[PDB]
Ligand binder design. Structure first.
Ligand SMILES: [Ca+2]
Length: 223
């Protein structure tokens, strides 16, 4: 996250870290056994880390649970990042408490202008490299589809939305991939892509979760 703030320990209790020997992506806990992330974050051998604030220090609230299965969206296109969504099932159920809690799926798509909370452990610079150890947060509005399509001509599908600041300076970034965009207390987006981070006229692009609710519900009911 570039230009954000320190969330504070366990104020984003649905945020997870995906670990393959190192943190590589975020995700969101949607119930005690399932996490949503980006398909572009797929790898074999994922450990899900819940209740994290400082990813480099054990502070005592964490739960580390291996993934049993990963399910990439059946229409994911790695070239265009269309349908950039994946489900991860945990080998055992998380213990839900005040520090580890699930986030609701949307029944409805969020509106342009809605302020959303984006979080993660990604890069904090638009130029250069500085990774934080503690969870960062950013509030950012959803942009109109026309401003989104203007920013990324020919690249925005109906399964994507833009959120951020056209002036630049504030954005998600590498390492935040997979993480939540929460608006009005529901998971509305997944950190997906953008051109650089925090660049002028290049806002963040997010998977539009409301288009996937039927697939998520069907998949969890059968796996
Ligand atoms: Ca920790």
């Amino acid at each position: 996250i570039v230009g954000g703030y320190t969330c504070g320990a366990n104020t984003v209790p649905y945020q997870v870290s995906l670990n393959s020997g190192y943190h590589f992506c975020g995700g969101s806990l949607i119930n005690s056994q399932w996490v949503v992330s980006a398909a572009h974050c797929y790898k074999s051998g994922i450990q899900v880390r819940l209740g994290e604030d400082n990813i480099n220090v054990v502070e005592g609230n964490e739960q580390f649970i291996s993934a049993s299965k990963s399910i990439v969206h059946p229409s994911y296109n790695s070239n265009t990042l269309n349908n950039d969504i994946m489900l991860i099932k945990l080998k055992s159920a998380a213990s839900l408490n005040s520090r580890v809690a699930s986030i609701s799926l949307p029944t409805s798509c969020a509106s342009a202008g809605t302020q959303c909370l984006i979080s993660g452990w990604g890069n904090t610079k638009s130029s250069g490299t500085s990774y934080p150890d503690v969870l960062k947060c950013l509030k950012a509005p959803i942009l109109s589809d026309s401003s989104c399509k203007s920013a990324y001509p020919g690249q925005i599908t109906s399964n994507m939305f833009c959120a951020g600041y056209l002036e630049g300076g504030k954005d998600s970034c590498q390492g935040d991939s997979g993480g939540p965009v929460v608006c009005s207390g529901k998971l509305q987006g997944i950190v997906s892509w953008g051109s650089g981070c925090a660049q002028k006229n290049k806002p963040g692009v997010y998977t539009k979760v409301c288009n996937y609710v039927s697939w998520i519900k069907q998949t969890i009911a059968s796996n």
